[PDB]
Amino acid sequence: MRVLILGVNGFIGNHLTERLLREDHYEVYGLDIGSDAISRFLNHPHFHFVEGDISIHSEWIEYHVKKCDVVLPLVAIATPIEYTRNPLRVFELDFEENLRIIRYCVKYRKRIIFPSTSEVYGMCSDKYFDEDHSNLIVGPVNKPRWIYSVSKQLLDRVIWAYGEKEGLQFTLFRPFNWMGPRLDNLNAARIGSSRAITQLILNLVEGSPIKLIDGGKQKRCFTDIRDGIEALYRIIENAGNRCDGEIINIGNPENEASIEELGEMLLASFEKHPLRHHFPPFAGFRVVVEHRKPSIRNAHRCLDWEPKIDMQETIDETLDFFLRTVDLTD
């Protein structure tokens, strides 16, 4: 099984590649423009680094789709300010360039495992966002923050249509704030790591304040990467072909917190940490979609999966690794 990861040089690429290389029947083709995040797999016999950029290359990516069996496109900009500061580039990369890769899979009859986004639900009023039943709610066109949500949704619909009409084999997945070791940089155009926890950990690391937009009462769910990657690994395995044509939220709905509470949890774990003294004093909380909890019935059904790691162990492990790998001279 040849697995093509586009945008391997990051969080998901790292953790997914580790997982697949444990198993004896995977060849991982990791496409990216750099390899610093995964440099320890470069010498692995079943890892294959592929030089590339999905905006520049046509034929090279197309080739690698043909060569491989399953494809995971992880290249996208999901930086909120960018939705308003550089909307066209968000659209071009996240929509147009990924659409080309989708069409390569259709053409060579390959399976695609596509990262949809939890942002597709928008201001959905269900308490549990359900992939198969929840209505998707966005604001008017004069609220440009929604361009990312709606681009990703239209891409889902296009995948769905290729599936219905052209026999594309797909699974869509929606990560909810995955977190752990080897988080993407905040401005890396790679899907997967919780931007909210990376930002907060960064605040503590830099000694900048934690912004609570309107008191930080908006609630989010957070998912350990060990749980998340286990689910994604099962989607790849696709026991019984039970993931075919499915849309699967991957998150831990019991790991719910407002940004305020997430703030306090991180701070507690931080102040307790043996390396805390390398970092500045706490600059403080700064007052400047109200809920986003996944239904995980689809993951229960298709993957026989449920999350095993509590909030506190994921927080602690995520923070610990981040602090330990910070370069203190830079």
Binding site: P209, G284, R286, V288
Partner: protein, 291 residues
């Protein structure tokens, strides 16, 4: 005495008016296309031919100027090189009006640089134009004091007033003939280039007084001194210097005081990005600043 004049800005306008009041016959005025007076409008109104070529250092213009047969040439804040092939056409020579106490501050924007450097005085100099730019012998020089509260625009008006006073007596003197000029001593000269946006960038590790002078040097209508709050640019339009924290850190938000390498700088008024001007306290809130 007939003359060909190169002029721009308020200094250009007052120089033309002074030549006219002194009885000079202005055959043509060379200026530039664009708060100050327009030399072109003044010329158009006085019925004096006016040209605004981007570059006169070409035989087309040498010949046009030669045909005008100037006895003398004057440069009043013209911004481009007027090469010798042109200046040598005037038997009585060429004279330039420069806004500094030459030999100090030769070059560009002496109005702003003297404020940047916290000078307590500056002046206007009328000098002969020689091969080397701004280095010719001095016909007369008039000093003015720079007050602690002067900013670019108030100093500009003082310089223009001094220029009017200087020209009113020196232009008739030149009309009478060569004046024994005062040589500039090269070892005492200083030269400045055109200011780039980087030259008005506030670096907080510097003394508050130096930053305050920078604010004064490019205050409105000039572009303003600027800095960043992370990735957000802001401009400091007016400031005040105040007599134990990281430079650049916020000491207080009302009034808005920023710690400097020495002392603190109060941002009295400023704006965030291309936003509107506001009092420092409001700017602090706009920028998300806290003590």
């Amino acid at each position: 005495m007939k003359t060909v004049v190169f002029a721009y800005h308020d200094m250009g306008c007052l120089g033309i008016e002074a030549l006219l009041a002194a009885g000079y016959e202005i055959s043509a005025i060379f200026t530039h296309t664009d708060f100050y007076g327009s030399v072109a409008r003044l010329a158009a109104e006085r019925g004096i031919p006016v040209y605004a070529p981007d570059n006169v250092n070409h035989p087309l213009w040498v010949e046009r100027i030669a045909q005008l047969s100037p006895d003398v040439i004057f440069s009043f804040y013209y911004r481009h090189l007027i090469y010798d092939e042109i200046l040598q056409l005037a038997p009585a020579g060429a004279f330039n009006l420069h806004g500094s106490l030459l030999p100090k501050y030769r070059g560009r924007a002496p109005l702003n640089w003297v404020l940047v450097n916290g000078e307590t005085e500056t002046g206007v100099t009328l000098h002969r134009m020689v091969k080397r730019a701004d280095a010719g012998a001095i016909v007369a020089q008039l000093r003015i004091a720079i007050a602690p509260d002067d900013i670019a625009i108030t100093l500009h008006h003082k310089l223009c007033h001094a220029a009017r006073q200087l020209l009113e007596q020196t232009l008739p003197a030149i009309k009478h003939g060569n004046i024994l000029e005062i040589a500039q001593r090269e070892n005492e000269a200083t030269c400045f280039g055109r200011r780039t946006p980087d030259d008005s960038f506030l670096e907080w590790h510097k003394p508050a007084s130096v930053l305050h002078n920078m604010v004064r040097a490019v205050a409105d209508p000039w572009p303003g001194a600027f800095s960043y709050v992370g990735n957000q640019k802001f401009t400091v339009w007016s400031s005040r210097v105040h007599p134990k924290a990281q430079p650049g850190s916020v000491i207080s938000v009302a009034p808005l005081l920023i710690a400097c390498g020495d002392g603190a700088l109060e941002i009295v008024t400023g704006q965030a990005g291309d936003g509107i001007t506001m009092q420092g306290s409001q700017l602090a809130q706009t920028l998300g600043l806290v003590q």
